Design a protein around this nucleic acid. Sequence first.
RNA 1: CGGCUACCCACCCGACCCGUCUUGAAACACGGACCAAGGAGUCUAACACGUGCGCGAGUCGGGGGCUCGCACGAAAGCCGC
RNA 2: GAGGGCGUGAAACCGUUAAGAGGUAAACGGGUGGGGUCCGCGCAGUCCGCCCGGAGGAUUCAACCCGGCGGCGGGUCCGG
Lengths: 187, 122, 52, 52, 147, 129, 52, 127
Amino acid sequence: GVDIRHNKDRKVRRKEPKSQDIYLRLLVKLYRFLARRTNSTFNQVVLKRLFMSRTNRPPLSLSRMIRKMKLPGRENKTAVVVGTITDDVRVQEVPKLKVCALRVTSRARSRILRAGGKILTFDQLALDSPKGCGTVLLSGPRKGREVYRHFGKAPGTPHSHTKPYVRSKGRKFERARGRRASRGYKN
Amino acid sequence: SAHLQWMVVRNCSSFLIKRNKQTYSTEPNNLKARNSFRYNGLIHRKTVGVEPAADGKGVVVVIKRRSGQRKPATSYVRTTINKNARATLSSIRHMIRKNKYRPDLRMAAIRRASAILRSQKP
Amino acid sequence: LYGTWRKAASLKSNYNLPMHKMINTDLSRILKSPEIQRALRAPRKKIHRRVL
Amino acid sequence: CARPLISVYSEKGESSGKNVTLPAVFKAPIRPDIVNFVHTNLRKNNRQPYAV
Amino acid sequence: PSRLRKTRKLRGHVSHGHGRIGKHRKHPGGRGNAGGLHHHRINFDKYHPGYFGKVGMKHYHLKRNQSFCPTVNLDKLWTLVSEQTRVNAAKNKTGAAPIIDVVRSGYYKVLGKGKLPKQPVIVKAKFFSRRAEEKIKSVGGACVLVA
Amino acid sequence: AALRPLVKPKIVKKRTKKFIRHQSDRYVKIKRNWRKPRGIDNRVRRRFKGQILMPNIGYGSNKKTKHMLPSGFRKFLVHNVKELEVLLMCNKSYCAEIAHNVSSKNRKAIVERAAQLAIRVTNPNARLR
Amino acid sequence: TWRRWHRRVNTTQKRYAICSALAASALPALVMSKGHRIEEVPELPLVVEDKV
Amino acid sequence: MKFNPFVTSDRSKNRKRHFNAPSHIRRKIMSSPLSKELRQKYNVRSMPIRKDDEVQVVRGHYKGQQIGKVVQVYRKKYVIYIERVQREKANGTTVHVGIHPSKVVITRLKLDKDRKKILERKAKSRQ
RNA sequence: CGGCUACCCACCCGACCCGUCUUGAAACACGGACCAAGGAGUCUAACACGUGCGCGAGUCGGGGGCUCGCACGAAAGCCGC
RNA sequence: GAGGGCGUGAAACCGUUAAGAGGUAAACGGGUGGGGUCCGCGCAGUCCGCCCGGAGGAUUCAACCCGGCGGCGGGUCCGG
Ligand SMILES: [Mg+2]
Ligand SMILES: [Mg+2]
Ligand SMILES: [Mg+2]
Ligand SMILES: [Mg+2]
Ligand SMILES: [Mg+2]
Ligand SMILES: [Mg+2]
Ligand SMILES: [Mg+2]
Ligand SMILES: [Mg+2]
Ligand SMILES: [Mg+2]
Ligand SMILES: [Mg+2]
Ligand SMILES: [Mg+2]
Ligand SMILES: [Mg+2]
Ligand SMILES: [Mg+2]
Ligand SMILES: [Mg+2]
Ligand SMILES: [Mg+2]
Ligand SMILES: [Mg+2]
Ligand SMILES: [Mg+2]
Ligand SMILES: [Mg+2]
């Protein structure tokens, strides 16, 4: 024996992307080459987000993609999103900014072309910025998923606010013993 | 779209004999039997191959035209060289070196032409 | 029956052509373009094997 | 994304003067894994169940 | 896919993924929701609180048909009518305002949110909230009740 | 003295016993293929001394001398003339092996094409008149 | 007899697979790698006249 | 390709109907082609065989230039027997040899009024 | 001449007969005379999580309808007031 | 070597022949040794592919250009 320490061989990581998409594999090859040949930590993080799963890449939204560029210092910069930018029903005005994302929805592309912006793809983003200069990388609302609101220490023991599983959100379904003080105990 | 064609053809083709050993292409226009990307005769816009002559004497060279794609009746232009092995080896050397046409696979074309001349002369 | 990316399909009611992921997808052309090769480190082909 | 012209061949084999622009269906992306997925599910649809 | 099933991988192990000691035979703990109060209280409680008892009134012959009132927000209030319509109706023309009838869209009750621009409209609905009614009065619109 | 291929070193296997199965000698219902015993009392699984040895990763041969015949080639199986002609580029390390279901009428043509292309065949003189 | 035999596919994925198959039927290398003899054949996808 | 759904491409049902067909179906099954001069003279491709038809054998152990007359037609065995084709047993007794009627070239037919009606229907349906 | 090898034999050393219930099996614990074939985690519904795909504030035709009568067509294509 | 439950014909079991062995019941793992069947090879003579200096024969390119077709490459984006 040599190592008294525990054998934790592989750390956590996903090396190759599990998606068999050919275009995604070509983007993985190109940004892997840029990440190991340009000394660009932006290319490192974009290559890791291409390694990242379909679920852990949440869809970006048009209002958030406006508001992250409305801040001072993001006028002439391009919005790089590893993920999808979708339509928003809320906003009315769209600025003259640039988009660099994968699989933008049709209404979003139509409204950006009406507003006068320019959408790109990752190969054009690489040809325009190998190191990734003039770019801002964005991510979407992971924790706002319906799945993540069931996750906690319990559904109700320090009242715990974490949404127990039930069929119908209403009367007669999980509302009596532990939900009110008149019927037994209360949390 | 050569990389798309490679990422499709590199599996699930009517080639790629994965039978008890490594991958062989057998690839009716090819220079090395290894099913690789740098040695491929169907996918690239510029391809070189050598084949034996139908008469039995000489080596024929099949090179891709590049003046027109998606038209396989004229996409491959052929020549029939019947020389005394050094004149034709120098001919394919000057044809690959003096042109821009495929600076790669020089030694692939040269080794296959030389091996088929050794297999052809007796 | 399917259309181009400018217009919709006139026979199918709610169909459009798919989004094109990589527009100009020649990877050899991209990696041999001068815009990419302007920002490369150095060709490092040393091996640095095991020294007894 | 350019749409070339394809000559129209007659019954004799000679290229006629008619030239029709290539539609964008042939310029659409190629996803053989999605083709294999939908093909697998339609093959599962394409069968009598079997003996019970 | 039985070739992707774990059972084909576990051929060769004696107890087949369920232990030699514990011996999972048929139904060790009960069936279904057995022992909801006796011996599985740490699973029915602490993971489904509220499960046991009565809560309120017993409305006999209830339908999800009389209480039908889909709620439309002020963000959804605009795109029920096209954007061309509101641009060509509020392109500095006059004091006229377009009418957005949510009963035609199928939504009965109008509720309040943010993001309501200065350009006023007329909203006809069966019900309103006081927040949305104050937002319409603040942007200068007209609140119209219909049946 | 047929073809004499390129530089191939001394081939070692680290053991050459093709490990027997436990109690295959005692019962003739047991084929001599290996099968990992998962008993709670077995001396083979407990790795007692004086017993049989289980196949593990340590008996792996060298990657340079992997799938190497004693002649110095690597075998590749062949059915017909085109699958013989695919070995035209690497004939100095890869030898041919004609399939069993090939008759003599095509087998003589395959071995003639192998003699023309200078490709080693493992069984040249089988199934002849 | 109540095994889940038949599998429904989304119509968008059905049309996606049709577009991908028709796009892959245009390249010569894909069809030659599938195995059709396109040696003496003229230009890719062949358009014949209405007298055929 | 089979288009009518009232007939089988089924091997088991076809073999069942074939090996259990009645004798009037077996007469149609046991039909023999004709010589080139007889089909040139009569304009007919195939005819059923009967007791007094002259037969040239085209395939088998005996082939060609054997224009003999049949004697028996076993429809149970699907076998006609020819007077010219013989084979001796162990004990020196001759016996006929099993010949399937589809490997049989008819050179001469027996004329009858019913066979003239059959030949007229053949020529009219061939048109 | 050379040859590892499912051939046979001898010699030195180690070596109790496998499977399980068990803290403990070679056990004076149980099943096993031998051999060939069959033989044990499947399927439906529901839920949850992870993954991949398409569309994406929308999504889904599984319910029907439309095409000429087609082996594969009990498939597939389309509906959109 | 298909002779009437007759295609193919394994294992358990038995007979005979050939070889080997036999006091610690038989059987096994590691290490060798002996014998036998079989395989590949020629056994004091088997290695090849290239260049050059030497000895005879037989041919015609190549070195340079005229004649000719087909492609590679960019410029006037000339002619459309
Ligand atoms: Mg260690
Ligand atoms: Mg460990
Ligand atoms: Mg285990
Ligand atoms: Mg217990
Ligand atoms: Mg248990
Ligand atoms: Mg133990
Ligand atoms: Mg049947
Ligand atoms: Mg235990
Ligand atoms: Mg005890
Ligand atoms: Mg035990
Ligand atoms: Mg007892
Ligand atoms: Mg026992
Ligand atoms: Mg017993
Ligand atoms: Mg069995
Ligand atoms: Mg999921
Ligand atoms: Mg028999
Ligand atoms: Mg037999
Ligand atoms: Mg004896």
